[PDB]
Amino acid sequence: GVVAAAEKTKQGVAEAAGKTKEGVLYVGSKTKEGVVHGVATVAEKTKEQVTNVGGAVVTGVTAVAQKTVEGAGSIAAATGF
Amino acid sequence: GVVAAAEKTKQGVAEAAGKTKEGVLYVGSKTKEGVVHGVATVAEKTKEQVTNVGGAVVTGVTAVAQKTVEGAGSIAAATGF
Amino acid sequence: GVVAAAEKTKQGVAEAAGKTKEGVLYVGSKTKEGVVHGVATVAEKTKEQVTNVGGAVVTGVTAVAQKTVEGAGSIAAATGF
Amino acid sequence: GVVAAAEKTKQGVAEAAGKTKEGVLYVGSKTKEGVVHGVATVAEKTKEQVTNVGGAVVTGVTAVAQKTVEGAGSIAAATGF
Amino acid sequence: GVVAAAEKTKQGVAEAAGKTKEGVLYVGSKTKEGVVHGVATVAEKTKEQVTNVGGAVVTGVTAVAQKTVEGAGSIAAATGF
Amino acid sequence: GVLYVGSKTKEGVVHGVATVAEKTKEQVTNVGGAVVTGVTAVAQKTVEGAGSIAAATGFVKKDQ
Amino acid sequence: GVLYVGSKTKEGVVHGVATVAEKTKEQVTNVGGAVVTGVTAVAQKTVEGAGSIAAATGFVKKDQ
Amino acid sequence: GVLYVGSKTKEGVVHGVATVAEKTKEQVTNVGGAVVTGVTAVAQKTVEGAGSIAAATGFVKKDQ
Amino acid sequence: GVLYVGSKTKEGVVHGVATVAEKTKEQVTNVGGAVVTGVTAVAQKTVEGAGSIAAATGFVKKDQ
Amino acid sequence: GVLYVGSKTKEGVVHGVATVAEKTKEQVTNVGGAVVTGVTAVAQKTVEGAGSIAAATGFVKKDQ
Numbered sequence: 001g002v003v004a005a006a007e008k009t010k011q012g013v014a015e016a017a018g019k020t021k022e023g024v025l026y027v028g029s030k031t032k033e034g035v036v037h038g039v040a041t042v043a044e045k046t047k048e049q050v051t052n053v054g055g056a057v058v059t060g061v062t063a064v065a066q067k068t069v070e071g072a073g074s075i076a077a078a079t080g081f
Numbered sequence: 082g083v084v085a086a087a088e089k090t091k092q093g094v095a096e097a098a099g100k101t102k103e104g105v106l107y108v109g110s111k112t113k114e115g116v117v118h119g120v121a122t123v124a125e126k127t128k129e130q131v132t133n134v135g136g137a138v139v140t141g142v143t144a145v146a147q148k149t150v151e152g153a154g155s156i157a158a159a160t161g162f
Numbered sequence: 163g164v165v166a167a168a169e170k171t172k173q174g175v176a177e178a179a180g181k182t183k184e185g186v187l188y189v190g191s192k193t194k195e196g197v198v199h200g201v202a203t204v205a206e207k208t209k210e211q212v213t214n215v216g217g218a219v220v221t222g223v224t225a226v227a228q229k230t231v232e233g234a235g236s237i238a239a240a241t242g243f
Numbered sequence: 244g245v246v247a248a249a250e251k252t253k254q255g256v257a258e259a260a261g262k263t264k265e266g267v268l269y270v271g272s273k274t275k276e277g278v279v280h281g282v283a284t285v286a287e288k289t290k291e292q293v294t295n296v297g298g299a300v301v302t303g304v305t306a307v308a309q310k311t312v313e314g315a316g317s318i319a320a321a322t323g324f
Numbered sequence: 325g326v327v328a329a330a331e332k333t334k335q336g337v338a339e340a341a342g343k344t345k346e347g348v349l350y351v352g353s354k355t356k357e358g359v360v361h362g363v364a365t366v367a368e369k370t371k372e373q374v375t376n377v378g379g380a381v382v383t384g385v386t387a388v389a390q391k392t393v394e395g396a397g398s399i400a401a402a403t404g405f
Numbered sequence: 406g407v408l409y410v411g412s413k414t415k416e417g418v419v420h421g422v423a424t425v426a427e428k429t430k431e432q433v434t435n436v437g438g439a440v441v442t443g444v445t446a447v448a449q450k451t452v453e454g455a456g457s458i459a460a461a462t463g464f465v466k467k468d469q
Numbered sequence: 470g471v472l473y474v475g476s477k478t479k480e481g482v483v484h485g486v487a488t489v490a491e492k493t494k495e496q497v498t499n500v501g502g503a504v505v506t507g508v509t510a511v512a513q514k515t516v517e518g519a520g521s522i523a524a525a526t527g528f529v530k531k532d533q
Numbered sequence: 534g535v536l537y538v539g540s541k542t543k544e545g546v547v548h549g550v551a552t553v554a555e556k557t558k559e560q561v562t563n564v565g566g567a568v569v570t571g572v573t574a575v576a577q578k579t580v581e582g583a584g585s586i587a588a589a590t591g592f593v594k595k596d597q
Numbered sequence: 598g599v600l601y602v603g604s605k606t607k608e609g610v611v612h613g614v615a616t617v618a619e620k621t622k623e624q625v626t627n628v629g630g631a632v633v634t635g636v637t638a639v640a641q642k643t644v645e646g647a648g649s650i651a652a653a654t655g656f657v658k659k660d661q
Numbered sequence: 662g663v664l665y666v667g668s669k670t671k672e673g674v675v676h677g678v679a680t681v682a683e684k685t686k687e688q689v690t691n692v693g694g695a696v697v698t699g700v701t702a703v704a705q706k707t708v709e710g711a712g713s714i715a716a717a718t719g720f721v722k723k724d725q
Contacts, residue, residue, distance in 0.1 A: 002164045002261070004085045004178035009168070009233030013433045015177045016085035020184035022266060023103035025444035028487030028551065029269070034307065036103045037199045038119045040475065040539030040603040046127045046208045052136040052194035055214040055295070056100045056157040056238070059222045060140045064147070064156060065115030065196075066226065071154035072233045072314075075226060076137075076218040076241045076295075078159045080083075082181070091517070103185060109423030110188070114227065121411065121475030122541035136214070154231075163343070164245045166259035171252045173432045173496045176319075178259045180365060184266035189360070190423075190487035190551030190615070191350070193270035195389065196277045196308030202603030202667040203284045210291045214557065217295040217376070218319070221303045228307070234314045237307060238299040240378075241322045245326045247340035252330070253626075254496045254560045258339045265347035269549035271615030271679070274351035276357045277389030283364045283603065283667025291372045295366045298376040299400070302384045309360075309388070315395045318388060319380040327651045352679030356667075361583045364667065365622035412473035413536070414516040416578070417514035420487040424508050426502075428492045438499040438563070441527030441591065449511075450481070453518035453582065454548070459526045460511075468532045474600070476537035476601075478544075479552045480642075481578035485549045488572050495555045500564040502627070505591030505655065506571045506635070513575075514545070517582035531595045539600035540665075544608045545642035551615045552636050558622045565689070566627040569655030569719070570635040571700070578609075581646040581710075586653065593657045604665035609706040613677045617701050620684045630691045633719030634699040642673075645710040655719045 034065035054078075115146035134158075196227035216240075277308035297321075358389035378402075417450035439463050483515035503527050545578035567591050609642035631655050673706035695719050 001059050006012040039061060050057050056076035087093040113137060131138050137157035147154050178193040200225060212219050218238035228235050249255040282304060293300050299319035309316050332335040375383050380400035388389060390397050425446050433440050443461040449459040488508050497504050504529040513523040552572050561568050569591040577587040610657050616636050620638040633655040680700050684721050697719040705715040 001084065001193045002083045002177040002178045004166045005233060006168045006174045006176040007088045009090045009171045009174040010083045011173045011434065012087040012090040012172040013175045013430050014085035014087040015096045016083045016098045017098045017179045018083040018100060018183045020101045021183045024103050024186045025106045025425060026188045027108045027192045027425050027489055028421060028485060029110045030192045031112045032194045032197050033114045034116065034117045034225050035113050035197045036223055036225045037197065037200045037482065038603065039223055040538055041203045042123045042170055042538050042600065042602050043205045043208050044125045046124050048129045048210045049137060050111045050131045050184045050212045051140050052214045053131045054135045054159060054161065054216045056137045056159045056218045057214050058139045058157050058220045059212065061117055061120055061142045063115050063117045063144045063225045064101045066154055066228045068154045068231045068233050071098065071149050071151060073154045073228055073230045074239050075094045075237045076220050077155050077212045078216060078218045078243045080161050080216060106425065108425055109421055119539065123474055123536065123538050134477055165260040165307045166247045166250045166261045168257040170250055170254045171255040173254045173434065173498065173691055175256045175430045175494050177287040181633050183264045186267045187489060187553065188269045189489050189553050190549060191272045193274045194278050196306050198279045198304055198306045200280060200603055201282045201304055204288045204664065205289050208289045212293045214295045216297045218299045219293060220294050220301045221293065223303060224305045226307045228309045228681065230311045230314050232313045232531065235309055235311045235316045236320050237318045238301050239320045240297060240299045242296060242297060243324045245332040245340045245342040247328045249336045249338040250384045252333045254335045254498065254562065256337045256494050256558050258342040260341045261342060262343045267348045268553060268617065269350045270553050270617050271355045272353045273615055274355045275359050276388050277388045278359045279385055279387045280359065280361045280383055281667055285366045285405045285666050286370050287368045289370045293374045295376045299377045299380045300374060300376050304385045305385045306371065309397050310331045310341065310391045312393045313395060314394045314552065316390055317401050318399045319382050321378060321380045335562065335626065337558050337622050348619060351680065351681055352613065399684055405623050407471045409473040413477040415482045416480045417482045417512045418482040419510045419512045420482065422508065422510045423487040425489040429490045429495065433485065433497045436501045437501045439503045439529050440497055440499050444508045445495040445526055446510045447509065447524040449523040450514045451518060452516045455519045457521045458525060460526065462526045464475045464525060464528045464530065465501040466530045467492045475539045477541045479542065479546045480544045481576045482546045483574045483576045484546065485561045486572065486574045487551045489553045491555045493554050493559065494564045495559045497561045499563045500565065500591045502565045502586045503567045503591045503593050504563050505569045508572045509590055510574045511588040513587040515582055516584040519583045521560055521571045522589060524590065526590045528589065528592045528594065533597045538606045541641055542606045543610050545640050546599050547640045547653050549613045550638045554618045556620045557618045560624045562626045562634045564628045566630045567657050568625060568627050568632045572636045573654055574638045576640045577651040579626045579643045579649045579656060580611040583646055584648045586650045588612045589653045591655045592653060595659045597661045599663050601665050602668050603667045605669045605676050607671045608703050609672045609673045611704045613676045614702045615679045617681045621682045622686045624688045626690045628692045630693045630695060631719045631721050632689060632691055634697045637718055638702045639716045640704045641715040642706045642715045643710055644708050647710060648712050650717065651716045652716045656717060657721045660721045661725050
């Protein structure tokens with residue numbers, strides 16, 4: 001039985017809301033998931049040498065965001081039967 | 082029975098809402114998932130040497146966003162039977 | 163039986179709300195999950211040498227955000243039968 | 244039976260709310276989960292040598308955020324049958 | 325039977341709330357879970373040598389945030405049958 | 406010989422101004438004055454010179 | 470010979486100004502004055518010079 | 534020979550200004566004066582010079 | 598030969614200003630004066646020079 | 662030859678200013694004076710020079 005009223009004014013508002021459910025507001029909100037940020041480096045002689053044989057290798061800079069409902073999520077999987 | 086009213090004014094508004102469900106608002110909101118950002122580097126002699134044999138190798142800068150419902154999500158998968 | 167009223171004014175508002183459920187507000191809120199941030203380095207001679215054989219290797223900078231409902235989540239999985 | 248009223252004013256407000264449930268507000272709130280931050284380093288000769296054989300190795304800088312409902316979450320899993 | 329009233333003023337407010345349940349407010353609140361922060365280092369000769377065989381090794385800087393409902397959460401799991 | 410490789414430089418920059426107004430009742434009765442109830446994002450960079458107004462929003466100027 | 474490799478530089482920068490107003494009743498009755506009830510993000514960078522107003526929002530100027 | 538590798542530099546920076554106003558009743562009756570009830574984020578960087586106003590919000594100037 | 602590798606530098610920085618106002622009744626009756634009831638984040642960096650106002654919010658100036 | 666590797670430096674920094682006002686009744690009746698009831702975060706860094714006001718909020722100046 002919600003009721004609002006505003007009479008005999010010069011400016012007037014009358015808002016009436018029987019039921020309300022607000023919602024989510026993201027205002028200027030940031031969100032990082034799996035992020036590499038600002039990696040500086042200074043060197044004179046750099047050498048990277050990977051020697052993989054029948055396996056999984058993951059090197060260097062890397063950012064992985066990964067959702068998996070029904071699977072064996074991984075970043076480097078090696079298997080043998 | 083929501084009711085609103087505004088009489089005998091010079092300016093007037095009358096809003097009436099029996100039911101409301103707001104929704105999501107993203108206003109100026111950022112979102113990063115699997116991001117590599119701002120990678121500086123200074124060198125004089127750089128050498129990268131990968132020697133892969135029957136395997137999975139993932140080098141260098143990399144950003145992976147990966148959703149997988151019913152599969153073995155990975156970044157480098159090696160397998161043998 | 164909510165009721166509001168504002169009479170005989172020069173400016174007037176009348177708000178009436180029988181029921182309310184507010185919602186989530188993210189205003190300028192940040193959120194990091196699995197983040198590598200600001201990695202400096204100074205060297206003269208750098209050498210990285212990986213020698214993987216039938217296994218899983220994960221080196222270098224890395225940021226992993228990983229949700230997994232029904233799977234063996236990992237970052238480096240090795241298996242043998 | 245909530246009731247509000249404001250009469251014979253020059254400025255007036257009349258708010259009436261029969262029931263209210265506020266919601267969560269994140270205002271300028273930060274949140275880090277699994278973060279590596281600000282890693283400096285100064286060296287003259289750096290050497291990293293990994294020699295993995297049939298196992299799981301996870302080196303270097305790393306940040307892992309990882310939720311897992313029904314799985315053996317890990318960072319480096321090795322197994323044999 | 326909550327009731328408010330404000331009559332014969334120059335400025336007036338009348339708020340009436342039959343029931344209220346406030347909500348959580350995070351205002352400028354920070355939160356870290358599994359964080360490595362500010363790791364300095366100065367060296368002349370650095371050497372890291374891992375020799376893993378059929379096992380799990382986790383070295384270097386690392387930050388792990390990890391929730392697991394129904395699984396054997398770990399950081400380095402080794403198993404044999 | 407300078408070098409800029411991927412460098413950034415922000416001088417006089419307004420960036421990321423969000424704003425929301427939900428169900429906000431508002432009533433104004435202005436008489437010969439200024440009223441400002443709105444967003445206003447202003448940037449400016451003046452190397453030199455004189456009298457460089459970058460924004461004059463919602464004002465009343467009655468000089469003599 | 471200088472070098473800038475991925476460097477950043479913010480001089481006079483306004484960044485990330487959020488604002489929300491929910492169900493806020495507001496009533497103003499201004500008479501020959503200034504009223505400001507709104508967001509205002511202003512940046513500025515003046516190397517040299519004179520009289521460089523970057524923003525003059527919602528004012529009343531009656532000089533003589 | 535200087536070097537900047539991933540360096541940052543903030544000079545005169547306003548950053549991350551959040552604000553919320555929920556169900557806030559507000560009533561103003563201004564007469565020939567200034568009233569400010571709003572967000573205001575101002576940055577500035579002046580190397581040299583003179584009289585560099587960066588923001589003059591919501592004021593009343595009646596000089597003589 | 599200097600080096601900056603991942604260095605940071607904040608000079609005159611305002612950072613992270615949160616604010617909430619929930620159900621706050623407010624009533625003002627200003628007459629020829631200043632009233633300020635709002636957020637205000639101001640930064641500034643002036644190397645040299647003179648008379649560099651960075652923000653003059655909500656004031657009343659009646660000189661002679 | 663200096664080195665900065667991941668160093669930080671805060672000079673004149675305001676950081677992390679939270680504020681909440683819940684159900685706060687407030688009533689003001691100002692007459693020719695100043696009233697300030699709001700947040701105010703101000704930073705400043707002046708190397709040298711003169712007369713560098715960084716913020717002049719909510720005031721009344723009537724000189725002669």
